[PDB]
Symmetry: C3
């Protein structure tokens, strides 16, 4: 509703995860405060231009990685992006791998998820009196997924074209027994802590949201179990590749998502009672 400075708008949102605290990519950056009914977003939103397209960047953990996954104000974050007018949201995330062939340094563009969080407090914007139950059979925006895959291929990076993300609560990493369940029983491919309820809220807000995930580790399955320092080090080492992909894809997002390839773009039509 109210922004400071007033009148700011953007077309593409980028939510940065681990290792991605500054835009890097935007020209003419302005830091913006956006009012939300839920209090503060993770940080200021930075708005600027990438080759003529207006981009809003939000670090989900805040500058300096001040906010762990369970403490993020997901409602405020998504409300703020919607309020600026964005239609496309690219999430950049660090994930662990549960399979040998999804190697550290590879990108993954997931197509499914399993929610094993428990402590996120709000999993929706809609608490009544209008009851909303969005369909999320195909939870990610296909239009954006396909563009991410294409960019990665063009630039010569390895991009796995599907994957099931298991979202765990944290902040601790999984035990060996848990990780065996995720891998062998649920047949998940990658694991992270931040996707839910971010994706749920993006869908309810009728945004075209997709995740560009970077594999940073093999969970508990290597000679060395994952540590936080390893994840951070691998993301910071590879952030330049993520930046190059963003520069490639963002100018192609000048238009609007195709309705037929955006499962959530009209989510509320059939979902509200």
């Amino acid at each position: 509703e109210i922004t400071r400075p007033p009148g700011v708008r953007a077309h593409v949102g980028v939510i940065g995860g681990s290792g991605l605290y500054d835009p890097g990519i935007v020209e003419n950056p302005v830091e913006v405060k956006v009012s939300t009914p839920y209090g503060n977003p993770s940080d200021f939103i930075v708005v600027g231009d990438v080759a003529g397209v207006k981009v809003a960047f939000l670090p989900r953990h805040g500058r300096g990685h001040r906010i762990p996954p369970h403490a993020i104000n997901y409602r405020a974050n998504i409300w703020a992006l919607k309020a600026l007018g964005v239609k496309w949201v690219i999430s950049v995330s660090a994930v662990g791998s549960l399979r040998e062939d999804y190697r550290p340094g590879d990108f993954v563009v997931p197509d499914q998820f399993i929610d094993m969080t428990k402590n996120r407090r709000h999993y929706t914007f809609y608490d009544g009196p209008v009851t909303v139950h969005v369909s999320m059979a195909d939870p990610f925006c296909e239009d954006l997924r396909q563009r991410l895959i294409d960019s990665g291929r063009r630039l010569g990076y390895t991009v796995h074209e599907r994957g099931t993300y298991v979202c765990i609560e944290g902040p601790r990493f999984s035990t060996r027994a848990e990780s065996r369940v995720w891998k062998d029983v649920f047949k998940a491919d990658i694991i992270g802590m931040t996707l839910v309820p971010e994706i749920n809220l993006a869908c309810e807000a009728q945004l075209c949201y997709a995740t560009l995930a970077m594999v940073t580790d093999y969970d508990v399955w290597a000679d060395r179990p994952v540590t936080a320092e390893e994840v951070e080090r691998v993301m910071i080492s590879n952030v330049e590749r993520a930046r190059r992909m963003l520069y490639d894809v963002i100018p192609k997002l000048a238009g609007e998502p195709e309705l037929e390839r955006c499962s959530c773009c009209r989510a509320l039509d059939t979902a509200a009672i």
Copy 2:
């Protein structure tokens, strides 16, 4: 404790789910306010007669479906019914099916459940100093289950005589990856959002509680994934069949549940320390 009007009592409770906001079935209806230590129940409770048996009706979502599953005051709802003196509780619910032969329009009388909720805040009435751990191996009241099955058969409707209900958090529906876990890994039969913690609280209150579920959809497994509008439309289309079953069964509930076929009727005897 206090009711307005004062002195109202009932013997059978009916909790209405999706599509069932008005009693329809009761004669001489009075709307009743029942004090609870937990604040407001979902709506007024309507008390009236069905062939000489006093019935209390509560729409779990409120009139007009104002309250989504995660926001329902389950403690207030069950406390209010207990306070009016009910011994039997029939829950009417919309569920999805995870198997081909449980078809939209069929009734199911489940015998088991798996709780995959996360955000319901209170899963018990007992927070100390008396610690209560009720056994729920067989969570539904067999006496009532059998009467529901019998009524359905007599009226010529399809009633599946068992089923495992997986209760998910919502309000979003399942992803395809989640639904595969519910179906193929957990081997659940039907899926819904409202059973837990309603059933837990009913058991702790020593009520004979059973669910009459109506299949409204096949989850994510049909050419079209479930939508909220579909569920509502199917329930409203079939509400008359649910009403006929209630009219048949309620007069047979004039007495008391048989202790040997009511797992929760003396739950507190062995459960409290």
Copy 3:
């Protein structure tokens, strides 16, 4: 920070579970109040001597079993023990068995866990601005596990040397359908309600924590499902065996945990960003 009386310190902590409300074991007991940023621990901590080693005893449920698993102030409990200077923490717990050969009366020293809680509110001490993600691949302290096993063997008791503990929310026990998932799908060995987030917090506080579990029941798999009264009766019947093990092991804990056999002893080195 502040204790009353002032200046009290201890080297070994014992957290008592079901049936273990009084130390029994300590000489020269003093009841101590320990300030925490999270309010009251479950009860006074009792500090005393066992053969020259200072021991702090805390009943997790409080004296008289006043606090159910979901209502325990886990943060306060672990903070209070850390504040007194303890390096070793022995947890004594009642568990159910999901396998025929883990029989009521047997001890188990688990090596893994699966967290299926949902309502514990805080799963960490670290909510920002320093983000902490501890590795818990091997969640228990091996040094202490091995000493517990050794003591049990020396005293002639049956001690199972490994096991996966599934932690459920409660306070109700599992349905038959849930218990089949824990046993047949997750391949867990034992089940309880109190391990999480106690273990998570112990690890973050860099303590050497292990569980000595006593099997009290076979969950839903016997002619009689578990009841709370059965669990309490079996623990109180066997508490003397648990006491004998504590007297044997505590004097051997005069020193410090071996770093190479204490996965959490330097947890924060790699975990904090």
